[PDB]
Every structure is written in structure tokens, then in C-alpha cells.
Scaffold this active site. Structure first.
Site, short mmCIF file in Angstrom:
data_model
loop_
_atom_site.label_atom_id
_atom_site.label_comp_id
_atom_site.label_asym_id
_atom_site.label_seq_id
_atom_site.Cartn_x
_atom_site.Cartn_y
_atom_site.Cartn_z
N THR C 13 47.38 20.96 39.49
CA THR C 13 48.26 20.22 38.56
C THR C 13 48.87 18.98 39.24
O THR C 13 49.15 17.95 38.57
CB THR C 13 49.34 21.17 38.01
N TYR C 27 45.47 20.29 29.74
CA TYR C 27 45.12 19.05 30.51
C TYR C 27 44.21 19.54 31.69
O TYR C 27 44.28 20.71 32.05
CB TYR C 27 46.38 18.25 31.01
N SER C 60 43.06 25.46 40.82
CA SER C 60 42.99 26.47 41.88
C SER C 60 42.65 27.84 41.41
O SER C 60 42.21 28.71 42.21
CB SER C 60 44.22 26.51 42.72
N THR C 93 48.77 25.27 42.29
CA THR C 93 49.75 26.30 42.64
C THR C 93 49.30 27.73 42.50
O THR C 93 49.77 28.59 43.20
CB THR C 93 51.06 26.15 41.80
N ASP C 94 48.34 27.99 41.56
CA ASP C 94 48.01 29.35 41.21
C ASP C 94 47.48 30.21 42.36
O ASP C 94 47.83 31.35 42.45
CB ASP C 94 46.99 29.37 40.04
N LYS C 166 53.86 32.59 44.87
CA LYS C 166 54.27 32.13 43.56
C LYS C 166 54.91 33.28 42.81
O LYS C 166 54.23 34.27 42.45
CB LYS C 166 53.03 31.61 42.84
N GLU C 287 49.00 61.49 54.11
CA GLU C 287 48.53 62.33 52.98
C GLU C 287 47.69 61.53 51.96
O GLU C 287 47.10 62.12 51.07
CB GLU C 287 49.70 63.00 52.22
#
Ligand code: ASP
Ligand code: ASP
Ligand code: ASP
Ligand code: ASP
Lengths: 325, 325, 325, 325
Positions: C13, C27, C60, C93-94, C166, C287
């Protein structure tokens, strides 16, 4: 084989004893002796060889600089001994951040110094003190804990004295450093170290107080709408050597506060502009009076200023302390 | 078809103009007129029919109670008109929480009153003011926004005036209510309402200030190690009607502070014990002097106390205000 | 005299361009070239001598391990040059946290590597990209920034790749490390360094990928009520070498998940139990099947597991990586 | 004069019993009976007339929808009785948020329903269960607690089932709603109510499950770099009626995930795009497949989707549920 830890008791709700399991006010903080604390968590004896010492037994809202000075002197004595591997200091929560930061600047040892406290009294249902103490002993006895600066341990978290603050009046999770996080956490009987603080402390600090018997007077004045000039006049009249300003936003100052700060500086008082907000950086601003607190909150800034005033009156030197300590 | 919104400008960094895109100090907050703000975000005109009014143009650290009183009076006048659907108030960030809480208690309308501010000046690279204003206008014009109390809108968040505070000196995300959250958020050009505050405000509030021309004097005193009695003596000597104490922990008080508070109460000054910590509840404690702030932080507590003193000196009534407003 | 910084663009972005100033979806992320980014913040040229390189231009969410491998290889090439002092990587950013953590483990240099991203597109009102880039360049060019591990810079904050995530779908302040804080902050054109991470990275890391052309397959499976065994069967059938489990609480596992994890381990798949909660430590538990993620969240844990599988299948060695990296 | 409260036990670490005071893994969650819990906090009997009922005794990672359905049915039966004023449900922490949100949508009463849990087992040093239960009983018996939706009470906090989530794997303070805050807090034996949720629930909800004996199958798929199409194929093949996607950022989707989601929708599976980030709004985006989760995290979104599928397949109706519940 076990570490040797001194538990040095000063008081606090951790040593509080009330009439019922849910009494939250009107009990004596600092009623119980250090051996009573130890005897309630016999598990501590599997982590360290512990010795208790009763330094004081007061509520931390009544802790004073003269006493914190002595505490720092005594901790420096203890850590110089080969039979002491670390020290855990039991303290009230209200001013632990002040006492801990003082020792962070003045204890000349890399051996761990861990303050511990409790938000619920020892008699309370689900009292947090027992586990907090156990965690503090674990931290103080671990070889990986050396050289980290002074620590504050509650609620599974290890906070740096320089960053940690009591953020909430009344909750078990109150101690946080929102922007700087914790040095580590204690989960599942194991210490997870996350961060080392990127600041001077302990063995790298210039702040020696071993010859001192008193500290310079520093007051804290709040910033708010309509804040009055007369509080600066009173502080000056009463012989303060420093004023820390808990400023509006980023240490910003009203016309009245500016007049007060200028009067203070004219009378040889150092002013540090901090923030009332709780977090973040007060940046330099040459249009304003005084020096700036960097990210030190008002209570921490007072402790650094007091110590800075034992060494210098040079505002370039003090300002550099605030950016490095 | 579009809502009619008045943008009432008071000043702040939102109307700040500096010499370069990265100048963070030494610029005049409240340099730009309300029409300059409007003309930089012409998008606002697709959300509402906007009219700008220049109420004042000052930096909010210089906002005073007498002026906030007039602002509340003017907003009450505006919202009584059929051609006004809501009001957006541009303000500096430093004391927005104080001004907003004052209006929250004194604006007798359910039409939206939205304070907006900016942490970066209008000239700054990535200035936050334009989007904050657009969001504030969207909130003020939405029919779902009625009856929510006074709001503070920055950084995609809608905070209640009673809970929201500037938590960080310097960051865009500074406004938070850690324990109480946001009333709503604005994402993707849409308002998401999450909470209604469970407190009295606006149309249900007793606090009418329409006949008033001044407010009772209230100061704020900080709590810390070695805090001095003399600041209480100075406040009393200067005619305060209230003192808010930014206390250690849960409004706890040293021996010196207790002496000061008792002296104040003996001279007819109401004391409210709040906290310096930033969050949470100061519980009642009959062993201590004064009344308690509930979850009001010191700046908010001062505003409520000032208004409470226009109506009563009955400590049972004031204490109940602090639990209900 | 100025540092030499390469701005290596991958998309996001930050390089997004929409039809209006408030378009938040639909976009193309990664439409604008690296020279367009540079030319929008000419201020960057006063902080460094910058050169742009277009590595990729994708959103991303479409970043893949094979490409991240190449990015790490290219950054290692660049930093070996004397005419490169640091590198700023523009990214969506993702998945920035995934790419950044990969480079944190694989870039064999102490010169700064700073990922930067933007939550609003370049065309947006109050777009955050310009200032984020300026801050990232400042960080990458500062001599004090060396040896800190890979960093992620948005919204005045410097996060370690190992801790930062994030946290919010849609807000400018989304990148936080709740328990570990920020390495530093950028306020008033100045860097304030707070922490050094107490973990292995970069020049002290064993993870060399310079001879590699592909990575082991690792999937992430979520933990929830009624979670199904069949997703483990499908992952095994499709040739995964690792599964990261985003577990309920502290990596806890249903009867169905246990059956799946046992089937995976029987077929030579390494299982790491992480948490869906967002924060904190998954402690060892003999365990339960699999290894534990320490404080690595699922996305980070996948990146470490993938790299661990290039070196070993020894569960003692992999478990130690998760406690040290 | 005292309220009549049923304590309905399902299991969890709150009813866990380990061999020592610091054993954190490998103990049976849901070992102790509801009368053992009650008998450890006899203080509860001064707040209410309590009756214990053993509904189940399992660790919450093994809680299943069919059982949660029965729990909701039983709670609806109980609250229809005049001799029941409220219900406290003891549960494991790992999936409490799922069970609580289910009841929030399906309990057709305004009488309080308070889930309670403990992060430390009952045998642990400083176990949190006793105080959490006492607080939960106080909340359930208070007349001011009616009509608030289903609540989750730990660590002095009252969280709405719709917002609250386990944010940390292992800490006492794990339950938080970062953006929405708490409904209230319990300090000093007093309830402080802060917020009412601005969402449909309980008596205003359409979600009646009184005639049902099973629920539609819904799986959760994670979003990450290289996420595979084959997990969507397996979910479809196994007869899911819904998929919740724990997406990258704001529900964003790779080329592979898009292919999977399209295949799912072609086979009559409803897809909800949520976020893996932990907080915030997934906004609508008509360029992407599926519906959006608003601020519902993946675990909550699954519960709403499951219930939505008992009533409709109309994507306009389901999408509106996600914006209103
Ligand atoms: N007033 C007590 C509070 C606490 O310890 O929690 C103290 O600071 O001594
Ligand atoms: N000092 C400015 C700060 C701001 O607006 O950000 C003001 O409060 O007017
Ligand atoms: N989907 C965008 C989101 C962003 O950059 O904010 C990306 O990750 O490429
Ligand atoms: N696994 C336990 C964890 C807890 O209760 O803390 C449970 O959810 O049943």
C-alpha cells in the site's frame, strides 16, 4: 549449588495483613516480618538459600529519599560480599518505581537486584505476593540475570527500573512499560529474557552515593488548564534545587508555568519538563524554559534529577544524563 | 439532504504552520484560520454542509476555564438552532481532554459534539489533521452519533470525553482509554459503534452553566516520595476551593500529604484523591482524608470538581457525582 | 558525509495509488515505482544519498518464500558493498513481519536493514507512507543503528522483526509488540533507542541461505472448538515438512488435533505448537505432541521452522532454535 | 434478601489439581467438582445463595459445539425459573470466548450469565480462581448487571463475550478487548460499570436454538505467505457449510486463497474474511470473495457463522448479522 539470596524487606501490601480475605483498604501495609513472608512460600528454599533482613516496615507512600539512600548503601554492601549472589527487595507498589530507579543508578554491581511487591495483601483471597516473591527469587538467583540493571518483578513479568511504572491504581497487572516492554517474563518456572535495556546503569553509572547522607530537594508540579504560578513561587521559597514539571502533552507549558519556570531558573533551580500523559518522549525545544525528560516519567525524572544535582549544575551535562540514563 | 455542521475553531497544532515539513517544536499552534483548514480537505463538503466559526486561536496549553465556559455556552447556543445538526471543535491535543469533558457535562443537547485535534502540524509530512477532521465531520453528521456524549476523534478512533486521555507525549495514536476502549472506530469511510458509555452526561446532566461567568478555583497536586506539605499551604493561601491529588497508587497519601489535606479540609477546601498512575479505580477509604476520584484521572477530576463546586459543598453529593459522571 | 542507502522496493500500500483520497479497498497495492516514492519525499535526500531499486511490485499478501529468499540474497549482496551503508525495504503491511523475520535470520551483516510500509495508500488524505519512509531512511543511515537485527519502521516506532506484528487489521498504529515493546522511537527528527533484543540474529545466526533455491513446505493450522483431523491429513498428503499450530491458549490441543499431530510426526513432519492468542509463551509440555514456539507467533514460527528444516530434523536442535532466535 | 445463583461447572484449569504449587502443565484441567470450588471460597455464601451443578468436567480445548448447544439450552432453562437470579459458568480459559459468545447470541434472558475461568490451577501458589469466582458471583447477583449480554470475569475485569478474547498464552491478565475495553471492573468489593455494548444480544437476538440438536460445520483457515489451496479443497470435501478465514491484515487473500474461496462459494460454502492480527475491522471489499467479519476475530466469527447458517444462506442477511451482533 543453590544461589545465596538475601531478601531485604522494606514493607508494602506484600507484608500487609487484614481482618478478612477481601479487605482492600484500612489494613497496615508492612505489618508482617520478612520471616513470615519466607515461611509462607517454602518453595523458595528449593530455588535459593535465602536469608531475610528487615530493613524497614513501612507503606511505600511513606518511603523517603533519605531512606532510599540508605537502602542503596546497604544493597551495595551486601553485593560486595562473596556469600551474596543477589538481593530481592520487598516493597510497597506505590513508590517501588522510584526506589528501584534510584538503586538502578547507584548500585555498583552486576549481581541481580530484584524489587518485588504485591497488589493484594498477604491475607487476601488469591494474594499475588507469594508467587511474585517466588518469581523474584528465581530471577535473582539465575546466572543469566546478571548485568541487566535493577528489575521489578510482579505478575510473571520482569520490568526494567528505568521503564516500568505502576499504570493502574488497583489491578494485579498494573506494572507495564507500554512503549519499552518487559526485559523478560517468567512462565512455567522458566525465565524468558527478551530485551536488554540500551541505557547506562549500575556498574556503568557515574552516580556514586556512598559518601552521601542527604539528597537535593526536588518537587514535582503538575500541568493543566489554569495551572498557577504560585506553586513555583512556593517551591522556590522552600529551597528546592529542582522542579520536575508533569507537563501538558510533550512538556508544554502555559504562560503562567513559563513565568514560574523562568523565576525558578533565575533562582538557580533546574527545571525538567516531563509529561503527565504516562508515556513517550518530551523532545527538546529551545523556545521553552528548562531541560527535557526524554522518556522519563515525572517520578523517574525526579530521581535522576536529584542524583544529577549531587554532581553538577551544568545544564548540558544534566540534559545528557536524561538522554543516557 | 447533507447534515449541517459548524466547525468551531479554537486553535491547536491542527491549525499549526511551520517553516518545513518536519518541524516538531517552535511553530505557532493556532496560526491557521478555520477556512484554511476547511479548504485543505474539500472532501468535507461531500459529507456535510460546513460552516466555519473562529472561536479562538490559541495553543491548548493556554486554554483556561473561563474560555472553556464560553465555549460550552456557545456550543449550547448553536445546538439549539434547527440549522445546526452537530458541531466539530478543532483544538490542541494537550488539554483537549479537559475541554471535551467540560462540554460533556454541560452541553444540554443530544446532537453530536466532536472535538478533533492533530499531533502533527498542518504543514508536516504525513500531517494527521486532514483525515482527523474528515473523520470528525463524518461522526458529527451521522444520525447514529446522537446521544453518545461528547466525543474526541483522532487516528480513526472515537473516544468518550469521560474516558479518553492523551497517553503519550508525542505519537499519533496517543489518545486511548486503556480500560474502557473506544466508543467507536472509523474505517473505510464507515463508522463502527462499539460502546455506549454507562455514565450521566449532556441532556441527563445537572451541570448547567448558562448563568455563570466564572468557575471555582481547583489545583492539582502530585504525589511522590518526599512530597511536601507546603504546596497544600500555598494552595489554601491562594483561595483554592478544591484540590485534586494525583496520588501514589490508589490515591494513597504520605504523612505530609495527609497533614496538608487535613489543613485544606479545615479551611473548607474539598479534596479529591485521584492517581498519578494513568488508569483505574481509586476506591473509597474511610481511614484517609478527602473523597475519591473513581476512575477519573487528575485532569478530568479537576473539571468535575470545579463543576460540582458550582452546585454544592456536600461531600456525599460530590462523591456521588464522581461515581456517576 | 551522508550515508549511502539503497531503497529496495517490493510493493505494498506504500506504493498504492487510488482514484480518490479516501479509497481504502480495490486499489492496486504496488502500482508506484520506487522513484515515485523517493520524489514525493525530497527531504530524504538531506538524510542520505539514496538509490532506488525495484525488486518486485506486489501486494504483500502475495509474497512467497521463494521471493523472500531472493530478497534476502540480494540484501546480503548489497550490504557486502562498501558503497552501501544500509538498506530500506518498502513492503506491504500484511506479511512484512514474515519477510522481515526471514531476513533477520539470514542477513549476515550488521549494517541496518529497515523494512517500511504504509497503512494508507500514497494517494490518501493524511497518507502515512511519506513520513514512515523518511523515518526508515533516518534509522538506516544512523551509525547507532548497527547490530540491532532487522527492523520494521512505521508510525514513529522501530520494532524488532522477531517481536513486531501487525496487531490490527486497519489502523496506522497496528504494529506493536505488546510484551516486548519497541527497540526505539523516532520523535522530533531524533532516534531514541530503548532496547536491544536478547536473541540471536543476523551476524550471529547459523541460518545461511546463500546456496539455496527453495524452502521446505510449512503450513499453519488453527486451533478452535471442533477443529478437524482432516486438515492434518491433507497437509501430510501434500508433502508438508512442518506444521505450525495456532493453538488454543498455550498451544493446547484437542483430541482431534492430537491425533493429527501424531499422524504428522509418524510421517516425518515437525509440529510446532504456537498460539492463536497473539502474545506470550507456549511452555514445554511433555504430555503433548510436537515442539513449542516459545514467544514466536504462528507467522514468525513458520519462518523459523522453514529455516530450521534446511539444517536439521533433530527435535532437540529445533526446540533450541525456538528458545534462542 | 441474597440473590440465588447457580454455579454451573464445565471444567477448566479453575477446577485443575496438580501435584505441587508450581506445576503449570501435565495436570488434569476439570478434575475438581463444583462443590470443591464452592467450599474453597466460603465467602461466596455471603454474596449469594449458591447452588452448584456439574454440567461437564473437561478441559476447554475439548469443548465442542454440540456440548455448547446443550449448555445454552440448560442456561435458558435455568434462567426461566424464578428461583434463579443469575448463573456463573466455570470453564477453561482456552475456548471460553467461543462458548461465552455462543451463549451471548442464544440465551433469551436479561438475567446475568457470567463465565469465569482461572489461568493457574486451584492448587497453585497465588491461584487466581478463588478471587475470579468470588468476583463472578458478585457480578451475577448484582441487579445492575442485568441486560448487559454475556460476560467473562477474570482478574478484576468484566468483559463482553462479543469483544473479550484470550490475548496471551499464559498470563493472568490475558483477557482483554484492546479496542473496546471492559464493560466494567470489580475493585474493593464494588462493581464499576463503564460501558454497555452497542450490539444485539440475548433477549434481542434472533438466534433461537431451542429446537436444535446439531450445528452447521464451520472450519477456520489461516492466511500467511504461501498459504495453500488444498486446505480449502479438503474443507469442501469434508462437508463444511462455512469457512472463516484468519486473513493477512484486513482479511486480505493471496491468489491461492482466492481460488480456494471461489471453489468454496461455488460449492455452497459461505466464506467470512476475518483477520489473524488480533484486533480491528475487516472492511467490505467487493473485489474480494466472501463476506467480511467486521471486528469479530476468527473464533467469534465462527460461532456467529454457525448460528447464521441455522437460519439463512442469504449473504446480505449474514453480512448484516456480522455488522449487528
Ligand atoms: N500502599 C501500599 C500499596 C501496595 O503495596 O500495593 C504500599 O505501597 O505500601
Ligand atoms: N501544544 C499543541 C499540541 C497539539 O495540538 O498537538 C496544543 O495543544 O495546542
Ligand atoms: N495489502 C497491502 C496492505 C498494506 O500494505 O497496508 C499489502 O500488504 O500489500
Ligand atoms: N487448558 C485449560 C487452560 C485454562 O483453563 O487456563 C482449559 O482451557 O481447560
Amino acid at each position: 549449588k543453590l544461589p545465596n539470596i538475601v531478601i531485604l524487606a522494606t514493607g508494602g501490601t506484600i507484608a500487609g495483613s487484614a481482618a478478612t480475605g477481601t479487605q482492600t483498604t484500612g489494613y497496615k501495609a508492612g505489618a508482617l516480618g520478612v520471616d513470615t513472608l519466607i515461611n509462607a512460600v517454602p518453595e523458595v528454599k528449593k530455588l535459593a538459600n535465602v536469608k531475610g533482613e528487615q530493613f524497614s516496615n513501612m507503606a511505600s507512600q511513606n518511603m523517603t529519599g533519605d531512606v532510599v539512600l540508605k537502602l542503596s548503601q546497604r544493597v551495595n554492601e551486601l553485593l560486595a560480599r562473596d556469600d551474596v549472589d543477589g538481593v530481592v527487595i520487598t516493597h510497597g507498589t506505590d513508590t517501588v518505581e522510584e526506589s528501584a530507579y534510584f538503586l538502578h543508578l547507584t548500585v555498583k554491581s552486576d549481581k541481580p537486584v530484584v524489587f518485588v511487591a504485591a497488589m493484594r495483601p498477604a491475607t487476601a483471597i488469591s494474594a499475588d505476593g507469594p508467587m511474585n516473591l517466588l518469581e523474584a527469587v528465581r530471577v535473582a538467583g539465575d546466572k543469566q540475570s546478571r548485568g541487566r540493571g535493577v528489575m521489578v518483578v510482579l505478575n510473571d513479568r520482569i520490568g526494567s527500573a528505568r521503564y516500568i511504572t505502576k499504570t493502574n491504581a488497583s489491578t494485579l497487572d498494573t506494572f507495564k512499560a507500554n512503549e519499552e516492554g518487559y526485559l523478560g517474563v517468567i512462565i512455567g518456572n522458566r525465565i524468558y529474557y527478551q530485551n536488554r535495556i540500551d541505557k547506562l546503569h549500575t556498574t556503568r553509572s557515574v552516580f556514586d552515593v556512598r559518601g552521601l547522607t542527604s539528597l537535593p530537594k526536588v518537587d514535582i508540579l503538575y500541568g493543566y488548564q489554569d495551572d498557577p504560578e504560585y506553586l513555583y513561587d512556593a517551591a522556590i521559597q522552600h529551597g528546592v534545587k529542582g522542579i520536575v514539571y508533569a507537563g501538558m502533552g510533550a512538556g508544554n507549558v502555559s504562560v503562567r508555568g513559563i513565568a514560574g519556570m523562568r523565576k525558578a531558573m533565575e533562582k538557580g533551580v533546574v527545571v525538567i519538563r516531563s509529561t503527565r500523559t504516562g508515556n513517550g518522549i518530551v523532545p527538546p525545544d529551545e523556545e521553552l524554559p528548562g531541560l527535557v525528560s526524554d522518556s522519563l516519567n515525572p517520578a523517574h525524572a525526579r530521581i535522576l534529577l536529584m542524583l544529577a544535582l549531587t554532581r553538577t549544575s551544568d545544564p548540558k551535562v544534566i540534559q545528557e544524563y536524561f538522554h543516557t540514563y
